[PDB]
C-alpha cells in the first residue's frame, strides 16, 4: 500500500523497517523481507495442504522462481523458473526425487514438453509450434522428433546445447522412388533429392517454423515462394 | 523427532568382512534417500554410496564402486553398510545421512544430507 | 569431480565479529550448495541448503550466498558456541564433493 506501491512481475503477478514488501497471489499473501525497495526477495508462504510455497525474485526483477515443497522445506514437488521475456521452464517431480515432467517455454509461444521420464532420461518428447505440434524420443544425448509418411521418416535432431540438426530415411529401394536428403548447418535448410534430382528445400527457421519450397522440374534450381507449414499434413504431403 | 542412530565402534583385520547398520526413525523410511559419507582420520568428507528403500536403488560413487555394498530394509527401517574385505587403509569414521533430492540439470539428480547419524568408527590393524 | 576450494583454512575472531567464509567451485553449480558444520567431536549438521535457505533451528546470525561458481557463508554476530568446522558441498554434478573445510576460533 502506502509506502511500498506495487511493480508488476514475469508471469501476471504483484508485489508490494525494523526492505519490507508483502506479495498475493494464488489466493493467499506471501510476504517476506528483502533488500532493496524494488521488489528483490524471497516470498514465504503456506498451503491448505500444509505444503511450503516459496517465491525467489531476483535483483533484476526480471527472473521469478515459484518453488512448491512438501511440509518439510527441503524435498520439492514443482519448480517453475520464468523470466522477463517469458521464457519459462517448469518442472516437476515424481516424489522419488528425480524429474518426471519438463516444461520448456519458448518466447514466442512455443512450448517444448517432456512427459514420461525415466530414472535415466528416455522419454516421451513433444514440441508444440503453432498450427500443429510434433512428437518424437528423447535419447541421454539429443532431442528426436519424427515425422513418418509411409516409408519417409524426418528426424530433427535437437543437440543438448541447442543446435538443430535434420535427417532423412527411406526405407524405400527403388532408385526412382527412394528420397535422400542434404542438410546445410549454416543455412538451416534440408534438401530432399530424388532420383538424383532435387525436389524441395526444409527450411528450419529462428522463429521455430518451417518452410517448403519445391525445386523445377530439372531440379537445377528453386522456383516460387515458400509455404510456411500449418497443418501437420504438410509436413507428410511434403515426404509422399 | 528425527533420529538416525548407527551402530557400535568395529574392530577388524585386513580381509574380514563387516556390515554395519543405521537404525532409522522419526520420519517416513520409505520417502527419504539414506546415504553414506566417510570421513578419514582427521580428514575431509568422502561420500560413499545412497540406497532409496522404496525399491531398493543403490547409486554408488565412482570412487567405492564394487568396493562396499549398501542395502535398506523397508521391513525394519535400517539401513546399512557392507564390506566384501576389509584393507588397512579403510579405517576412517563413517555416517548415515538422511538425503533430500535435487534435479542437478541434466540427466540425473544429487543430494544434500540434513540428518546425519552419531558416526561408525572401524578401526583396521593386525 | 568437481573440486571445491573454500577459503581460508583457520580464522580468528572475537565475539561479535562478523565472519565470512567463501567456497569456490570449477563449474557452475548455481543454486546447488549446502553449508554444515562439524563442531568439537562429532558430528556434522546442516546449516543452509540451497546456498540462500536457511534450515529450520538455525539461528539467525547464520546467512549464506552465492551463484555461478563463488559462494560465501556468513556469521552476522559470532558466538562462543559457533566455534567448529563449517564444509561447504557441491551437489549439482554427480557425484557429490564436499570441500576441505574451514576452521573457525574465538578470540577472548
Known amino acids: 500500500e502506502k509506502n511500498s506501491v506495487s511493480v508488476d512481475l514475469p508471469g501476471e503477478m504483484k508485489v508490494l523497517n525494523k526492505y519490507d514488501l508483502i506479495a498475493t497471489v494464488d489466493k493467499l499473501e506471501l510476504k517476506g523481507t528483502s533488500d532493496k525497495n524494488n521488489g528483490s526477495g524471497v516470498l514465504e508462504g503456506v498451503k491448505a495442504d500444509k505444503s511450503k510455497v516459496k517465491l525467489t525474485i531476483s535483483d533484476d526483477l526480471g527472473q521469478t522462481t515459484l518453488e512448491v515443497f512438501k511440509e518439510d522445506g527441503k524435498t520439492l514437488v514443482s519448480k517453475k523458473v520464468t523470466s522477463k521475456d517469458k521464457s519459462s521452464t517448469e518442472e516437476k517431480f515424481n516424489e522419488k526425487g528425480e524429474v518426471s515432467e519438463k516444461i520448456i517455454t519458448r518466447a514466442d509461444g512455443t512450448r517444448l514438453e517432456y512427459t514420461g521420464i525415466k530414472s535415466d532420461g528416455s522419454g516421451k518428447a513433444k514440441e508444440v509450434l503453432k498450427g500443429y505440434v510434433l512428437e518424437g524420443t528423447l535419447t541421454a544425448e539429443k532431442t528426436t522428433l519424427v515425422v513418418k509418411e509411409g516409408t519417409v521418416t524426418l528426424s530433427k535432431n535437437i543437440s543438448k546445447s541447442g543446435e538443430v540438426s535434420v535427417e532423412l530415411n527411406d526405407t524405400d529401394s527403388s532408385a526412382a522412388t527412394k528420397k535422400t536428403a542434404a542438410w546445410n548447418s549454416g543455412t538451416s535448410t534440408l534438401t530432399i533429392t530424388v532420383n538424383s534430382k532435387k525436389t524441395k528445400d526444409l527450411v528450419f527457421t529462428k522463429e521455430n517454423t518451417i518452410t517448403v519450397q519445391q525445386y523445377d522440374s530439372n531440379g537445377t534450381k528453386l522456383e516460387g515462394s515458400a509455404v510456411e507449414i500449418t497443418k501437420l499434413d504438410e509436413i507428410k504431403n511434403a515426404l509422399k | 523427532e528425527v533420529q538416525l542412530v548407527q551402530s557400535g565402534a568395529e574392530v577388524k583385520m585386513p580381509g574380514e568382512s563387516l556390515k554395519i547398520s543405521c537404525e532409522v526413525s522419526?520420519?517416513?523410511?520409505?520417502?527419504?534417500?539414506i546415504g553414506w559419507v566417510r570421513q578419514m582420520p582427521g580428514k575431509g568428507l568422502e561420500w560413499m554410496g545412497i540406497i532409496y528403500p522404496g525399491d531398493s536403488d543403490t547409486r554408488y560413487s565412482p570412487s567405492f564402486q564394487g568396493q562396499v555394498t549398501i542395502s535398506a530394509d523397508k521391513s525394519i527401517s535400517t539401513a546399512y553398510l557392507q564390506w566384501s574385505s576389509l584393507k588397512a587403509s579403510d579405517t576412517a569414521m563413517y555416517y548415515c545421512?538422511?538425503?533430500?533430492?535435487?534435479?542437478?540439470?541434466?540427466?540425473?539428480?544429487?543430494?544434500?544430507?540434513?540428518?546425519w547419524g552419531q558416526g561408525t568408527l572401524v578401526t583396521v590393524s593386525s | 569431480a568437481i573440486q571445491l576450494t573454500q577459503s581460508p583454512s583457520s580464522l580468528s575472531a572475537s565475539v561479535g565479529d562478523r565472519v565470512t567464509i567463501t567456497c569456490r567451485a570449477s563449474?557452475?553449480?548455481?543454486?546447488?550448495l549446502a553449508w554444515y558444520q562439524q563442531k568439537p567431536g562429532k558430528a556434522p549438521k546442516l546449516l543452509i541448503y540451497?546456498?540462500?535457505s536457511l534450515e529450520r533451528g538455525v539461528p539467525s546470525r547464520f546467512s549464506g550466498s552465492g551463484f555461478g561458481t563463488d559462494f560465501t557463508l556468513t556469521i552476522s554476530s559470532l558466538q562462543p558456541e559457533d566455534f567448529a568446522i563449517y564444509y561447504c558441498q557441491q551437489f549439482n554434478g554427480f557425484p557429490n564433493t564436499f570441500g576441505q573445510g574451514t576452521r573457525v576460533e574465538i578470540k577472548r
Open positions: 563449474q557452475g553449480i548455481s543454486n546447488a
Open positions: 545421512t538422511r538425503s533430500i533430492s535435487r534435479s542437478g540439470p541434466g540427466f540425473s539428480l544429487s543430494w544434500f544430507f540434513d540428518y
Open positions: 522419526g520420519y517416513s523410511f520409505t520417502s527419504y534417500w
Open positions: 540451497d546456498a540462500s
